[PDB]
């Protein structure tokens, strides 16, 4: 009803990752397939056991069709390098697969601007499809967005943050963990955002130890 399809109509009945990827490039579950270049679906394997989710595609991963390429990947990095993950083991995508941003002039453009929970929810069918594909013991949600998109719209990372969490309406029940996301780290206060990458390092760890 006045709650949306989205994504719905657009995901094709297939756990094949690259049957999903180039579906994606189809949809138009939102608007937002239009201002952007293409859809930025996940990097890695099915073989993967832990999933990390981000918020939605930066301009370069825009233009690379790839998520985590620009700044925040590197930030990123330096936490999976602390620890002592490796990031081509993990199934890396985003709660929204179009890079939302604005061309108003004049101020910065192609910098990522905040998806609508009406853009999330409507985005949110590729999610379920790619958690059906890889099947992961422990998803880990980088930052409020996507901790939003699978835990719910009155979600808040900063309540939870760390803790090994289960929903009830998410196939094959994974463990997931909310963390900080990587590009809140890019500026900000020095001491809040150290302990932030901290605690994003704990949580890495914790996600890698758990097995539900
Ligand atoms: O892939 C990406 C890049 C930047 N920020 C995100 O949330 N995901
Ligand atoms: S952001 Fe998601 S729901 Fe919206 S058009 Fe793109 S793929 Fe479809």
Redesign the pocket.
């Given at each position: 009803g006045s709650h949306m399809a989205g994504a719905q109509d657009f995901v094709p009945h297939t756990a094949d990752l690259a049957e999903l990827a180039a579906a994606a490039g189809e949809c138009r579950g939102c608007g937002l397939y239009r201002d952007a270049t293409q859809a930025?679906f996940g990097a890695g394997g099915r073989s993967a056991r832990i999933m990390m989710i981000?918020?939605?595609?930066?301009d370069?991963?825009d233009l690379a069709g790839?998520?985590?390429?620009?700044?925040?990947?590197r930030l990123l990095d330096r936490a999976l390098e602390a620890a002592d993950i490796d990031r081509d083991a993990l199934y890396?995508?985003?709660?929204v697969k179009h890079f939302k941003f604005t061309r108003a002039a004049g101020g910065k453009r192609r910098i990522?601007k905040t998806p609508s929970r009406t853009e999330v929810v409507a985005c949110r069918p590729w999610l379920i499809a790619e958690m059906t594909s890889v099947e992961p013991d422990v998803v880990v949600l980088?930052?409020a967005?996507?901790a939003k998109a699978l835990l719910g719209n009155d979600f808040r990372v900063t309540q939870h943050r760390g803790e090994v969490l289960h929903v009830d309406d998410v196939p094959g029940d994974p463990a997931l963990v909310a963390t900080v996301?990587?590009?809140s780290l890019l500026r900000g206060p020095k001491e809040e955002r150290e302990s932030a990458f901290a605690g994003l390092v704990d949580d890495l760890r914790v996600a890698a130890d758990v097995r539900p």
């Open positions: 930025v981000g918020e939605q595609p930066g370069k991963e790839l998520p985590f390429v620009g700044p925040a990947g890396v995508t985003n709660a990522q980088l930052g967005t996507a996301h990587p590009s």
